[PDB]
Each structure stands twice: as structure tokens, then as C-alpha cells.
Amino acid sequence: APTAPSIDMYGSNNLQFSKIELAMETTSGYNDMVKYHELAKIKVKFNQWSGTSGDTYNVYFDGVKVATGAITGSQTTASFEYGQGGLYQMEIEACDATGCSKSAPVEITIADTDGSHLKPLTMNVDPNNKSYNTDPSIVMGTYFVEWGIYGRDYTVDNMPVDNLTHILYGFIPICGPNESVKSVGGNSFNALQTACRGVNDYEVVIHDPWAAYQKSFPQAGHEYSTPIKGNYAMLMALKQRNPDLKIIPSIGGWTLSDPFYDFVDKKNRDTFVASVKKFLKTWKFYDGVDIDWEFPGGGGAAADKGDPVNDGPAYIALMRELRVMLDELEAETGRTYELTSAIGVGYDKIEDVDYADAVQYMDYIFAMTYDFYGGWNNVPGHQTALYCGSFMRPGQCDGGGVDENGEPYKGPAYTADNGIQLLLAQGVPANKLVLGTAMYGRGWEGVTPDTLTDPNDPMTGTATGKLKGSTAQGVWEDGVIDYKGIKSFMLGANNTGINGFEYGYDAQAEAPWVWNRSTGELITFDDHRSVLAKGNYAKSLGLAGLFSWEIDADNGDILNAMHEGMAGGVVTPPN
Ligand SMILES: CC(=O)[C@]1(O)Cc2c(O)c3c(c(O)c2[C@@H](O[C@H]2C[C@H](N)[C@H](O)[C@H](C)O2)C1)C(=O)c1ccccc1C3=O
């Protein structure tokens, strides 16, 4: 028989092959950094120095023949293409009329972006996240933010994945007009300019390729030479651990919505929709797309954008067009892909979209039932309440009243139930609506007792400015604090108040607060009680479930309460 091939490990890239080429140690345009191949090119060098070399080689993976070719003398390169990622035991055989001889087996890795070559992720979850048996029909969602791996030190293996059905990855930008990004300062705008170099306007890109696929995480077993690293390789490994998890890219958000206002022109929708199809073929761990346009009709970060007449019909066409495209991917892959969107729930945001038309294309609407009041002005209120608080004036709740100047309210007050009932009354099915819960507070300073019109209720006071604090306290920007910061610096373990704060609860609104009467610091947030009230409300109305912004800011208490409030319930999944 021929001499047995001897595989040259170093001549064959130590047997690590990848369907995706990702630039490392540089930051450039997205199309220069990312290249995806439907088939990996596998080149393996072998030699047969003594004896006869034979005529033909065969390559086997786990005992099954996957390639064949000609022997070229004493040194041959087996060259072939292969579609399915994975880890395989490879043998190379050489054959002639006298028989065949085979190399020892050796492990070959074929990387792909579904994580098929990866072991299940090793988790490091805070043990305060508890175990539940929530019915699998109920949505339990959260947002994981790409920049959370910096100062916030919160990585994919920290997520309590057994307690989640959906992870929304915040946020994928659209190339084009993006002046709103300059509002976060730092390098965010400039990093987008880099990512969009050589990219057509209105196509998606990865904003931070260091966080997404270059950074080596030692807890994931990454090495500097591993072909896919970053949060994306950890999400691939997380999907190997929890295969029924849905991981969905969230496009837009508050700072990254400016390009959506040009989707009134179909040509820019077509560009965008094609880029999303390419994105989901490239990054196969993702299960759909979430569109967080804030907001049709305006009222978001860009003060000079928003068209109440035309943005709603653009949003609806976008959804129609994205569902056509996802149906093509389902035909191609045999997989199911979801289309979702996070939406404003003030009456003046809902009135700009005919959701009865849009929602026929969509699996879920993540209703943003939070940010109703906040440090952008000096008016206290409940930022994430179900119902109207004691602080509101007569006729403020339903908008029939007048304000303190005698001016008509323009619509119903900002509460979760006022927005859910506006959506239901126009025919959006309850089982497509997912109710938002806040894992953060918004707050003020200067709300001292002398400013209250009702002494029992600090939401009747007036602020002098935003809450101020440090990042160790969970205050990453003025006026906003992580829930785990409120728990460590204002509630304490018994939930009865520390550091001069007192806890209170508006039982009408279903909304908690902490208030330091000395500093006038007042913070509106969600807590165990108010999250249990949201789960009861969701069960009462047959909503799809609950989601939360943002998972790094919880200590486990808010996701635990999301599950606790849903116990016993089931829902009909949308078809
Ligand atoms: C209740 C409501 O309708 C709001 O639009 C909600 C809101 C908000 O959700 C966020 C922000 C807001 O400023 C506001 C407020 O808009 C501001 C700017 C508007 N153009 C308008 O002038 C309004 C009165 O206040 C009011 C943010 O600033 C913000 C910043 C960073 C991330 C998310 C956020 C973030 O999510």
C-alpha cells in the first residue's frame, strides 16, 4: 500500500478553518473587516517522504469521506470546500491499486457563525438570579448592550440565560445621517464613521468590532488567534448551551434612529432590507430583526426630524418588506425568523403609526412602557407606572382636563395602561404585545419637602436638576441610575431605606420611589412590587409577556420578579 500521509499541522494552519474572515488588530470599514463564505476553503498539506505515494487521496471527517483528489509526489495539498461548521476527527488516506494507508486522526475545526464548532458557554451568573418554571410560551426578554463590557463589566456569560426567552442586542447602527450619536460624546460618532467607510448609506454595520468579535474573553477560552472572539462568539457559544434562546439584533435606539426618517423613500428601504438579509446570512446566531425607530413622527433625539404624515406608512412598508425578506431566508435555511419592534407608548407616538396594519407582519411589539418622566426636565412623575399616579391633576389621566395654567391636555397621560389600551383598541392583538420593565431609575435633585403641593407625595414637588452620582453608584449619566445602584445606595437589603432615603409606593399607579428629604434626591424606578403588578396585568390582558431594559443594571431582583409575576400563566404564541 502507499506510505501513510503525514499531516503537516503548521503547513495547514494548525487545522483551524473559518467560514468568516474577520480583521483583527485594526479598525476599518465594515466591508473591509468582514468577509463571509458559504463554503470554507480547507487546505491541508501532507507528505509521504519514504515509500510509494500512490495515486489518489481521500479525506475523512469522523469516518465519513468528504473529499478526494490526486496525490502529487512526496508532498500534496488536499484542497476542498466544506459547508458545515463543527469539530471533526480528520484522517487523510492515500490509495493506489495495491491498497490504501491512512494518517493518524487529528481534530479539524471549521468555524461558523452559528457556533457549531463551539462548546456550550461556561456561565458566571450572579446567584441572586433564581430558578423558575415559567411556561415556555411567555416572552421573558431583555436587552444586552454591546458597550456593557467596558466600565459596566457585564459580559455575555453574566446573563441569566435560563430566565430569558429573547435577548435583544443593542444596537446595530445604519450608515447615513447620524448626528444624534454625537450626543453621547466620546468616540461613538467617529467609530461609526470608520465602520461606514466604503459602506453604502442605509446599510447596517457593526458599531464596535472590538466588542463584537475581536476582544479575547478568557472566560470563553478565547486566545488571541481564535478566529471569532468578542461578544458575538460568546453569543454563539450561549446558543449552543440554550438552543431555544432567540437572539435578535436591535437596529436603532434613541441615538441611532436618524437614518430611519429617510425611509419615506423606498430606495433607501430596499438598500436597508438587503443589508439586513446579508447581515443575518453572515451572523447566523441571530434569529430575526428588531427595529427600534425612535420615533415615527419625531419626538426623539433629532429635533429637526419626524414626519407625522409619512413616517407611519414608511414604518408599515418597512415591516412588509422586511417580512418578505425574512420569508426568503426561511425558504433558504428552513429556520424560523422573527420580526419585532420596540415602540413609544405615549399617545402622540402611537397616533403616528397605523399599527393595525403594521402588526400583521410582526411577531412581537416591545412596548417601551418606561421613560414617561425623567431628568430632561424638573417635573417629577412615575417613569414606568401602569396607571395614573396620585400626583396627576383632574382630567390629566384621560387628557380631558386642563393643566395648572388652564391649558387643555393634549392627550392621555404617559402611563403603561394608557398606551396598551390605545394599541388594543385599534386591533393590535394582546398576544403580540410585550410589556416593558425598567432595570433603572430616573431621578432629580432639589425636590425638597417645601416644594410639595401634597406633603405625602414627593411626585408633587419640583426639582432643581438631574440626580448626580458616580459610576460606582450606577450613575453612568446624570439623572439615570442602575437598579442595582438603587438597591446598594438607597434601598438596602431590607428595602426599607439607607443613606437618608425613604421608600414609598403609589398604590394607584403601581410605582415605587426613593426620596432623600435632605438632598431632595428623588428616583422613580421599578421594584419587586411594581414588577409583580406588571406581570399580573400582563396575565389579565393576555399579553405575550415582559421585557426589560437593560440586563447589566439588574442584580437579579427585577428579572426574578418578572418571572414571579407570571407564575401559572400561559399564552398563545403568535402563529
Ligand atoms: C416622555 C417622552 O416622550 C420623552 O421623549 C422620553 C425620553 C426618552 O425616552 C429618552 C430621552 C429623553 O430625553 C426623553 C424626553 O425627550 C426629550 C427630547 C424630545 N425631542 C422632546 O423635546 C421631549 C419634551 O423631551 C421625553 C433621552 O434623553 C435619552 C438619552 C439617552 C438614551 C435614552 C434616552 C431616552 O430614552
Coordinates of C-alpha atoms and ligand atoms in Angstrom, one line a residue:
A1 CA 0.0 0.0 0.0
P2 CA 1.2 3.6 -0.3
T3 CA 3.1 5.2 2.6
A4 CA 0.6 6.7 5.1
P5 CA 0.2 10.5 4.7
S6 CA 1.8 12.5 7.5
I7 CA -0.2 15.7 8.1
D8 CA 1.8 19.0 8.3
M9 CA 0.0 20.7 11.0
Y10 CA 1.9 24.0 10.6
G11 CA 1.6 23.8 6.7
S12 CA -2.2 23.6 7.2
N13 CA -2.9 26.5 9.6
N14 CA -2.9 24.1 12.5
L15 CA -6.2 22.9 11.2
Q16 CA -8.3 25.9 12.2
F17 CA -10.5 27.0 9.3
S18 CA -13.2 29.6 9.4
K19 CA -16.2 30.5 7.1
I20 CA -15.8 34.1 8.2
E21 CA -12.7 36.3 7.8
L22 CA -12.6 38.9 10.4
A23 CA -9.9 41.6 10.5
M24 CA -8.0 41.7 13.7
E25 CA -5.7 44.4 15.2
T26 CA -7.2 47.2 13.0
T27 CA -10.4 49.1 12.7
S28 CA -11.6 49.9 9.2
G29 CA -14.9 49.9 7.1
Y30 CA -17.3 47.0 7.7
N31 CA -16.9 45.6 4.2
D32 CA -13.1 45.6 4.6
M33 CA -13.3 43.9 8.0
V34 CA -15.9 41.2 7.5
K35 CA -16.0 38.6 4.7
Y36 CA -18.4 35.6 4.8
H37 CA -18.1 32.5 2.7
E38 CA -20.9 30.0 2.1
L39 CA -18.2 27.3 2.0
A40 CA -14.9 27.2 3.9
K41 CA -11.7 26.6 1.9
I42 CA -9.9 23.7 3.6
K43 CA -6.2 23.3 2.6
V44 CA -4.3 20.6 4.3
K45 CA -0.7 19.8 3.5
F46 CA 0.7 16.3 3.9
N47 CA 3.8 14.4 2.9
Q48 CA 4.9 10.8 2.2
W49 CA 8.7 11.0 2.2
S50 CA 9.6 7.3 2.1
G51 CA 7.9 4.5 0.0
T52 CA 5.3 4.9 -2.7
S53 CA 2.9 7.9 -2.5
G54 CA 0.1 6.4 -4.5
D55 CA -2.4 8.0 -6.9
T56 CA -5.3 9.4 -5.0
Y57 CA -6.1 10.8 -1.6
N58 CA -9.3 10.7 0.4
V59 CA -10.2 13.0 3.4
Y60 CA -12.5 11.7 6.1
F61 CA -14.3 13.6 8.8
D62 CA -15.5 11.3 11.7
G63 CA -15.0 8.3 9.4
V64 CA -17.1 9.7 6.5
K65 CA -15.4 10.6 3.2
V66 CA -15.6 14.3 2.5
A67 CA -13.0 14.9 -0.3
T68 CA -10.8 13.2 -2.8
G69 CA -8.1 14.3 -5.2
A70 CA -4.7 13.5 -6.8
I71 CA -1.5 12.7 -5.0
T72 CA 1.3 14.9 -6.3
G73 CA 4.5 13.0 -5.4
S74 CA 6.0 13.3 -2.0
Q75 CA 4.1 16.4 -0.9
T76 CA 0.5 17.0 -1.6
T77 CA -2.1 19.7 -0.5
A78 CA -5.6 18.4 -0.1
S79 CA -7.8 21.4 -1.2
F80 CA -11.6 21.2 -0.9
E81 CA -14.6 23.2 0.3
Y82 CA -16.9 22.4 3.2
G83 CA -20.2 24.0 4.4
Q84 CA -21.0 22.7 7.9
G85 CA -19.1 24.1 10.9
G86 CA -18.0 21.9 13.6
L87 CA -15.1 20.0 15.2
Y88 CA -14.2 16.7 13.4
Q89 CA -11.7 13.9 13.6
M90 CA -9.8 14.1 10.3
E91 CA -7.9 11.4 8.6
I92 CA -6.2 11.5 5.2
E93 CA -5.8 8.3 3.2
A94 CA -3.6 7.6 0.1
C95 CA -4.6 5.0 -2.4
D96 CA -3.4 3.1 -5.4
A97 CA -4.1 -0.4 -6.9
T98 CA -2.2 -2.1 -4.1
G99 CA -4.3 -0.6 -1.2
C100 CA -4.7 2.4 1.0
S101 CA -2.9 3.8 4.0
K102 CA -4.2 6.5 6.4
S103 CA -2.8 9.1 8.7
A104 CA -3.4 9.2 12.4
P105 CA -6.7 11.1 13.2
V106 CA -6.4 14.8 14.1
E107 CA -9.0 17.3 15.2
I108 CA -10.0 19.9 12.5
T109 CA -12.1 23.0 13.4
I110 CA -14.4 24.6 10.9
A111 CA -15.7 27.8 12.5
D112 CA -19.1 29.2 11.5
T113 CA -21.2 32.0 13.0
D114 CA -23.9 29.7 14.3
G115 CA -21.3 28.5 16.9
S116 CA -21.4 24.8 15.5
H117 CA -17.7 24.5 16.4
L118 CA -18.1 25.7 20.0
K119 CA -18.8 24.0 23.3
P120 CA -21.7 25.5 25.4
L121 CA -20.7 28.7 27.1
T122 CA -19.4 28.5 30.7
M123 CA -21.7 30.8 32.7
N124 CA -20.9 33.1 35.6
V125 CA -24.3 34.4 36.7
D126 CA -25.0 36.2 40.0
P127 CA -26.7 33.6 42.2
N128 CA -29.3 36.1 43.3
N129 CA -30.9 35.1 39.9
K130 CA -33.3 32.4 40.9
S131 CA -34.9 29.4 39.1
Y132 CA -38.4 29.3 37.9
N133 CA -40.7 27.1 35.8
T134 CA -42.3 29.8 33.7
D135 CA -44.3 28.4 30.8
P136 CA -42.3 28.5 27.6
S137 CA -45.0 30.3 25.7
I138 CA -44.4 33.5 27.7
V139 CA -41.8 36.1 26.5
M140 CA -39.1 37.0 29.0
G141 CA -36.9 39.4 27.2
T142 CA -34.1 41.7 27.9
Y143 CA -31.5 44.0 26.1
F144 CA -27.8 43.3 26.3
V145 CA -25.7 46.3 25.3
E146 CA -22.5 46.0 23.2
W147 CA -20.7 48.6 25.3
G148 CA -21.6 46.9 28.6
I149 CA -18.3 45.0 28.6
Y150 CA -16.3 48.2 29.4
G151 CA -17.0 50.2 32.6
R152 CA -20.1 48.3 33.4
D153 CA -18.0 45.0 33.3
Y154 CA -21.0 42.9 32.3
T155 CA -20.4 40.2 29.7
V156 CA -22.4 37.6 27.9
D157 CA -21.6 34.8 30.4
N158 CA -23.1 37.0 33.2
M159 CA -26.6 36.9 31.7
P160 CA -29.2 34.6 33.5
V161 CA -29.9 32.9 30.2
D162 CA -32.2 30.2 31.7
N163 CA -34.5 33.0 32.7
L164 CA -34.7 34.6 29.3
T165 CA -36.5 33.7 26.1
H166 CA -35.2 36.6 24.0
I167 CA -32.0 38.7 24.1
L168 CA -32.1 41.9 22.1
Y169 CA -28.6 43.0 21.2
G170 CA -28.3 46.8 21.5
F171 CA -27.5 48.3 18.9
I172 CA -26.7 47.9 15.3
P173 CA -26.4 51.3 13.5
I174 CA -27.5 52.2 9.9
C175 CA -24.9 54.1 7.9
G176 CA -26.0 57.6 6.9
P177 CA -27.2 60.7 8.9
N178 CA -26.3 60.1 12.5
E179 CA -25.8 63.5 14.2
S180 CA -27.7 62.2 17.2
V181 CA -24.8 59.9 18.1
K182 CA -22.7 63.0 18.9
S183 CA -25.0 63.5 22.0
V184 CA -23.2 60.5 23.8
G185 CA -19.8 62.2 23.2
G186 CA -16.6 60.1 23.3
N187 CA -15.7 58.1 20.2
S188 CA -19.1 56.8 19.2
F189 CA -19.7 59.1 16.2
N190 CA -16.1 58.6 14.9
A191 CA -16.3 54.8 15.3
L192 CA -19.4 54.8 13.2
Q193 CA -17.7 57.0 10.5
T194 CA -14.9 54.4 10.4
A195 CA -17.4 51.4 10.2
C196 CA -19.3 53.1 7.4
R197 CA -16.1 53.9 5.3
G198 CA -16.8 52.1 1.9
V199 CA -20.3 51.1 3.0
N200 CA -23.4 52.4 1.2
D201 CA -25.7 54.7 3.2
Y202 CA -28.7 52.9 4.7
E203 CA -26.9 49.6 5.2
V204 CA -26.3 48.1 8.6
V205 CA -22.8 47.8 10.2
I206 CA -21.3 46.7 13.5
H207 CA -20.6 49.8 15.5
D208 CA -17.8 48.4 17.7
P209 CA -15.9 45.4 16.2
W210 CA -13.6 45.2 19.2
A211 CA -16.5 44.4 21.5
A212 CA -18.4 42.5 18.8
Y213 CA -15.7 40.0 17.6
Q214 CA -12.1 41.0 18.3
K215 CA -11.7 41.2 22.1
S216 CA -10.5 37.9 23.7
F217 CA -12.6 36.8 26.6
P218 CA -10.6 34.4 28.8
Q219 CA -13.7 33.0 30.4
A220 CA -14.8 31.9 27.0
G221 CA -11.5 30.1 26.3
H222 CA -10.6 32.7 23.7
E223 CA -6.9 33.0 22.5
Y224 CA -5.6 35.9 20.6
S225 CA -5.6 33.7 17.4
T226 CA -9.1 32.3 17.8
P227 CA -11.0 33.2 14.6
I228 CA -14.2 34.7 16.2
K229 CA -14.0 36.3 19.6
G230 CA -15.9 39.2 21.3
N231 CA -19.5 39.3 22.4
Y232 CA -20.6 37.6 19.2
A233 CA -18.5 34.4 19.7
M234 CA -19.9 34.3 23.3
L235 CA -23.5 34.6 22.0
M236 CA -22.7 31.7 19.6
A237 CA -21.5 29.6 22.5
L238 CA -24.6 30.7 24.5
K239 CA -26.8 29.5 21.7
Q240 CA -25.0 26.1 21.9
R241 CA -25.9 25.9 25.6
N242 CA -29.5 27.2 25.2
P243 CA -30.7 26.3 21.7
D244 CA -34.2 27.5 22.1
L245 CA -33.0 31.0 23.0
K246 CA -33.8 33.7 20.5
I247 CA -31.0 36.3 20.0
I248 CA -32.2 39.3 17.9
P249 CA -30.2 42.4 16.8
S250 CA -31.8 45.6 17.7
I251 CA -31.4 48.2 15.0
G252 CA -31.6 51.9 16.0
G253 CA -32.5 53.0 19.5
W254 CA -32.5 56.6 20.8
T255 CA -29.2 57.7 19.4
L256 CA -29.1 55.6 16.2
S257 CA -32.5 56.3 14.7
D258 CA -31.7 59.3 12.4
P259 CA -31.4 57.3 9.2
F260 CA -34.9 55.8 9.6
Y261 CA -36.5 59.2 8.8
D262 CA -35.2 58.8 5.2
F263 CA -37.2 55.5 4.8
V264 CA -40.0 57.6 3.2
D265 CA -38.1 56.9 0.0
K266 CA -38.5 53.1 -0.8
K267 CA -35.0 53.1 -2.5
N268 CA -33.5 53.5 1.0
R269 CA -35.7 50.8 2.5
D270 CA -34.6 48.5 -0.3
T271 CA -30.9 49.1 0.5
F272 CA -31.5 48.6 4.2
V273 CA -33.6 45.4 3.8
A274 CA -31.0 43.8 1.6
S275 CA -28.2 44.7 4.0
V276 CA -30.2 43.1 6.9
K277 CA -30.6 39.8 4.8
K278 CA -26.8 39.8 4.2
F279 CA -26.2 40.5 7.9
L280 CA -28.3 37.5 9.0
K281 CA -26.6 35.2 6.5
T282 CA -23.2 36.4 7.9
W283 CA -24.1 36.1 11.6
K284 CA -26.1 33.0 11.8
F285 CA -26.6 33.0 15.7
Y286 CA -29.2 35.8 15.1
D287 CA -32.9 34.8 14.8
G288 CA -34.6 37.8 13.3
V289 CA -34.5 41.6 13.5
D290 CA -35.8 44.1 15.9
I291 CA -36.5 47.7 14.7
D292 CA -36.2 50.4 17.4
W293 CA -37.0 53.5 15.4
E294 CA -37.4 56.3 18.0
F295 CA -39.8 57.5 16.6
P296 CA -42.0 57.7 13.6
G297 CA -43.3 61.2 13.5
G298 CA -40.4 62.6 15.6
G299 CA -40.0 63.5 19.3
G300 CA -36.7 61.5 19.6
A301 CA -33.1 62.6 19.8
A302 CA -33.3 64.6 16.5
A303 CA -35.2 67.7 17.0
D304 CA -35.1 68.5 13.2
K305 CA -36.6 65.1 12.1
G306 CA -40.0 63.4 12.1
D307 CA -42.9 63.5 9.6
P308 CA -46.3 62.6 11.3
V309 CA -47.9 62.1 7.8
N310 CA -45.3 59.9 6.1
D311 CA -43.3 58.1 8.7
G312 CA -46.1 55.7 9.7
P313 CA -46.7 54.5 6.2
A314 CA -42.9 54.1 5.8
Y315 CA -42.7 52.0 9.0
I316 CA -45.5 49.8 7.8
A317 CA -43.9 49.3 4.4
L318 CA -40.6 48.6 6.1
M319 CA -42.2 45.8 8.1
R320 CA -44.0 44.4 5.0
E321 CA -40.6 44.5 3.1
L322 CA -38.6 43.0 6.0
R323 CA -41.2 40.2 6.3
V324 CA -40.8 39.4 2.5
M325 CA -37.1 39.2 3.1
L326 CA -37.3 37.0 6.2
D327 CA -39.6 34.6 4.3
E328 CA -36.8 34.3 1.7
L329 CA -34.4 33.4 4.5
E330 CA -36.8 30.9 6.0
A331 CA -37.1 29.2 2.5
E332 CA -33.3 29.2 2.2
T333 CA -32.5 27.8 5.6
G334 CA -35.5 26.0 6.9
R335 CA -35.3 28.2 10.0
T336 CA -38.0 30.5 11.6
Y337 CA -37.1 34.2 11.8
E338 CA -38.9 36.8 13.9
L339 CA -39.6 40.4 13.2
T340 CA -40.1 42.7 16.2
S341 CA -40.0 46.4 17.1
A342 CA -39.8 48.5 20.2
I343 CA -42.2 51.4 20.1
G344 CA -43.1 54.5 22.0
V345 CA -46.3 54.2 24.1
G346 CA -47.3 57.9 24.6
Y347 CA -50.5 58.7 22.7
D348 CA -48.5 61.1 20.5
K349 CA -46.2 58.4 19.4
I350 CA -48.9 55.7 18.8
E351 CA -51.0 58.1 16.8
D352 CA -48.3 58.4 14.1
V353 CA -48.4 54.6 13.1
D354 CA -51.4 52.5 12.0
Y355 CA -50.4 49.5 14.0
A356 CA -53.4 47.6 13.0
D357 CA -51.8 47.4 9.5
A358 CA -48.1 47.0 10.7
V359 CA -48.6 44.3 13.2
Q360 CA -49.8 41.8 10.7
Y361 CA -46.2 41.4 9.6
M362 CA -44.6 41.3 13.1
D363 CA -44.2 38.6 15.8
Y364 CA -43.9 41.0 18.8
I365 CA -44.2 44.7 19.7
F366 CA -41.9 45.5 22.7
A367 CA -44.0 48.4 24.2
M368 CA -41.5 50.9 25.8
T369 CA -43.6 51.4 29.0
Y370 CA -40.9 53.4 30.7
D371 CA -39.2 56.9 30.3
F372 CA -42.5 58.6 30.9
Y373 CA -40.9 61.2 33.3
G374 CA -37.2 62.0 33.8
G375 CA -34.3 64.4 34.3
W376 CA -34.7 66.0 30.9
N377 CA -36.9 68.5 32.9
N378 CA -37.7 69.3 36.5
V379 CA -41.2 67.8 36.7
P380 CA -41.3 64.7 38.9
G381 CA -43.5 61.7 37.9
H382 CA -43.6 58.0 37.6
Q383 CA -41.4 56.9 34.8
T384 CA -42.7 53.3 34.3
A385 CA -46.1 53.2 36.1
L386 CA -49.1 51.1 35.0
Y387 CA -51.7 53.6 35.9
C388 CA -52.1 57.3 36.6
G389 CA -50.5 58.5 39.9
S390 CA -52.0 60.4 42.8
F391 CA -49.8 63.4 41.7
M392 CA -51.7 63.9 38.4
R393 CA -54.4 66.7 38.1
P394 CA -58.1 66.1 37.5
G395 CA -58.6 65.0 33.9
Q396 CA -54.8 64.6 33.3
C397 CA -55.1 60.8 33.2
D398 CA -57.6 60.6 30.2
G399 CA -56.5 64.1 28.8
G400 CA -59.9 65.7 29.2
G401 CA -58.7 68.1 31.9
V402 CA -56.7 71.3 31.9
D403 CA -53.2 72.0 33.4
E404 CA -52.3 74.4 36.1
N405 CA -52.4 77.3 33.5
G406 CA -55.8 76.3 32.3
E407 CA -54.4 74.8 29.0
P408 CA -56.1 71.6 27.6
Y409 CA -54.1 68.5 28.0
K410 CA -53.4 67.3 24.5
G411 CA -53.9 63.6 25.1
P412 CA -53.9 61.0 27.9
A413 CA -51.2 61.0 30.4
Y414 CA -48.0 58.9 29.9
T415 CA -48.8 55.6 31.7
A416 CA -48.4 52.0 30.5
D417 CA -52.1 51.2 30.5
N418 CA -53.0 54.3 28.5
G419 CA -50.6 53.2 25.7
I420 CA -51.5 49.5 25.9
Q421 CA -55.3 50.4 25.7
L422 CA -54.6 52.7 22.6
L423 CA -52.9 49.8 20.9
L424 CA -55.6 47.2 21.8
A425 CA -58.4 49.5 20.8
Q426 CA -57.1 49.7 17.2
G427 CA -56.9 46.0 16.9
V428 CA -53.3 45.1 17.9
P429 CA -53.6 41.6 19.3
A430 CA -52.7 41.3 23.0
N431 CA -50.7 38.2 22.4
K432 CA -48.2 40.3 20.2
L433 CA -47.6 43.0 22.9
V434 CA -44.7 42.6 25.4
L435 CA -44.8 44.9 28.4
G436 CA -41.6 46.8 29.4
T437 CA -40.0 46.8 32.8
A438 CA -37.2 49.2 33.8
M439 CA -34.0 47.9 35.4
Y440 CA -33.0 51.5 36.2
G441 CA -34.4 54.7 37.8
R442 CA -34.6 58.2 36.6
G443 CA -34.2 61.0 39.1
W444 CA -33.8 64.5 40.3
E445 CA -32.3 66.5 43.0
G446 CA -33.7 69.5 44.8
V447 CA -37.2 68.0 45.4
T448 CA -37.2 69.2 49.0
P449 CA -40.3 68.9 51.3
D450 CA -41.2 72.7 50.9
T451 CA -41.8 72.2 47.1
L452 CA -44.6 69.5 47.5
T453 CA -48.2 70.5 47.0
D454 CA -49.2 67.3 48.7
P455 CA -46.9 66.6 51.7
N456 CA -47.4 62.8 51.4
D457 CA -46.3 62.7 47.8
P458 CA -42.9 63.8 46.5
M459 CA -44.2 63.4 42.9
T460 CA -46.0 66.7 43.6
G461 CA -42.7 68.6 44.2
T462 CA -40.3 70.4 41.8
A463 CA -36.8 69.6 41.1
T464 CA -33.7 71.8 40.6
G465 CA -31.8 69.5 38.3
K466 CA -30.9 65.8 37.5
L467 CA -29.7 63.2 40.0
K468 CA -25.9 63.3 40.2
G469 CA -23.7 60.4 41.2
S470 CA -20.7 58.2 40.3
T471 CA -20.3 55.2 38.1
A472 CA -19.7 53.0 41.2
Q473 CA -23.2 54.1 42.4
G474 CA -24.6 53.0 39.0
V475 CA -25.0 56.6 37.7
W476 CA -23.5 56.4 34.2
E477 CA -25.1 59.6 33.1
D478 CA -26.8 62.3 35.1
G479 CA -30.4 61.6 36.0
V480 CA -30.3 57.8 35.4
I481 CA -29.2 55.1 37.9
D482 CA -28.9 51.3 37.6
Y483 CA -31.4 49.4 39.7
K484 CA -28.5 47.6 41.4
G485 CA -27.3 51.1 42.4
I486 CA -30.6 52.0 43.9
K487 CA -30.6 48.7 45.8
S488 CA -27.0 49.3 47.1
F489 CA -27.2 53.0 47.8
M490 CA -30.8 53.8 48.6
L491 CA -32.9 50.7 49.5
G492 CA -30.6 48.3 51.3
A493 CA -31.1 44.6 51.7
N494 CA -34.4 45.0 53.7
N495 CA -35.8 47.5 51.2
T496 CA -36.5 50.0 54.0
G497 CA -34.1 52.8 53.0
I498 CA -30.5 53.7 53.7
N499 CA -28.3 56.7 53.3
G500 CA -31.1 59.1 54.2
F501 CA -33.6 57.7 51.6
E502 CA -37.0 56.6 52.4
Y503 CA -39.0 54.2 50.2
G504 CA -42.6 54.9 49.1
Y505 CA -45.2 53.3 46.7
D506 CA -48.1 54.8 44.8
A507 CA -50.6 52.1 45.1
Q508 CA -52.9 53.6 42.5
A509 CA -50.1 54.0 39.9
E510 CA -48.2 50.8 40.8
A511 CA -45.0 52.7 41.1
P512 CA -42.2 52.9 43.7
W513 CA -39.8 55.7 44.6
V514 CA -37.0 56.5 46.9
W515 CA -36.6 60.0 48.3
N516 CA -34.0 61.7 50.5
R517 CA -35.8 64.7 52.0
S518 CA -32.4 66.4 53.0
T519 CA -30.9 66.4 49.5
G520 CA -34.2 66.4 47.6
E521 CA -32.9 63.4 45.6
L522 CA -36.0 61.6 44.2
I523 CA -35.8 58.5 42.0
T524 CA -38.6 56.7 40.0
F525 CA -38.0 53.1 39.1
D526 CA -39.5 49.6 39.0
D527 CA -39.2 47.3 42.1
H528 CA -40.4 43.9 43.1
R529 CA -44.0 45.1 43.9
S530 CA -44.4 47.1 40.7
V531 CA -43.0 44.3 38.5
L532 CA -45.3 41.8 40.2
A533 CA -48.2 44.3 39.3
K534 CA -47.0 44.3 35.7
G535 CA -46.9 40.5 35.5
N536 CA -50.5 40.4 36.9
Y537 CA -51.6 42.9 34.4
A538 CA -50.0 41.0 31.6
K539 CA -51.7 37.8 32.7
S540 CA -55.1 39.7 33.0
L541 CA -54.9 41.1 29.4
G542 CA -53.3 38.1 27.8
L543 CA -50.1 40.0 26.8
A544 CA -47.2 38.0 25.3
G545 CA -45.0 38.6 28.4
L546 CA -42.5 41.1 29.7
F547 CA -39.1 42.5 28.6
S548 CA -36.6 44.8 30.3
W549 CA -34.0 47.4 29.5
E550 CA -31.1 46.8 30.4
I551 CA -29.8 43.5 31.8
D552 CA -26.5 44.7 33.2
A553 CA -28.3 47.1 35.5
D554 CA -30.2 44.3 37.4
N555 CA -28.9 42.4 40.3
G556 CA -31.4 39.6 39.7
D557 CA -34.3 41.2 41.6
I558 CA -36.1 42.6 38.6
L559 CA -35.9 39.5 36.3
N560 CA -36.8 37.3 39.3
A561 CA -40.0 39.5 39.8
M562 CA -40.8 39.3 36.1
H563 CA -40.9 35.5 36.4
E564 CA -42.7 35.5 39.8
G565 CA -45.4 37.8 38.5
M566 CA -46.0 35.4 35.5
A567 CA -46.3 32.3 37.6
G568 CA -49.1 30.0 36.4
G569 CA -49.7 31.8 33.2
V570 CA -49.6 30.6 29.6
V571 CA -50.3 32.5 26.4
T572 CA -51.0 31.6 22.8
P573 CA -47.7 32.4 20.8
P574 CA -48.4 34.5 17.7
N575 CA -48.8 31.9 14.7
Ligands
LIG1 C1 -41.7 61.1 27.7 C2 -41.1 61.3 26.3 O1 -41.9 61.3 25.3 C3 -39.6 61.6 26.0 O2 -39.4 61.9 24.6 C4 -38.9 60.4 26.5 C5 -37.3 60.5 26.5 C6 -36.6 59.3 26.4 O3 -37.3 58.2 26.2 C7 -35.2 59.4 26.4 C8 -34.6 60.6 26.5 C9 -35.3 61.8 26.6 O4 -34.6 62.9 26.7 C10 -36.7 61.7 26.6 C11 -37.6 63.0 26.7 O5 -37.4 63.5 25.3 C12 -36.9 64.9 25.3 C13 -36.4 65.3 23.8 C14 -37.6 65.4 22.9 N1 -37.2 65.7 21.5 C15 -38.7 66.4 23.4 O6 -38.1 67.7 23.4 C16 -39.1 66.0 24.9 C17 -40.1 67.0 25.5 O7 -38.0 65.7 25.8 C18 -39.1 62.9 26.8 C19 -33.1 60.8 26.4 O8 -32.6 61.9 26.5 C20 -32.3 59.6 26.3 C21 -30.9 59.7 26.2 C22 -30.1 58.6 26.1 C23 -30.8 57.4 26.0 C24 -32.2 57.2 26.0 C25 -33.0 58.4 26.2 C26 -34.4 58.3 26.2 O9 -34.9 57.2 26.1

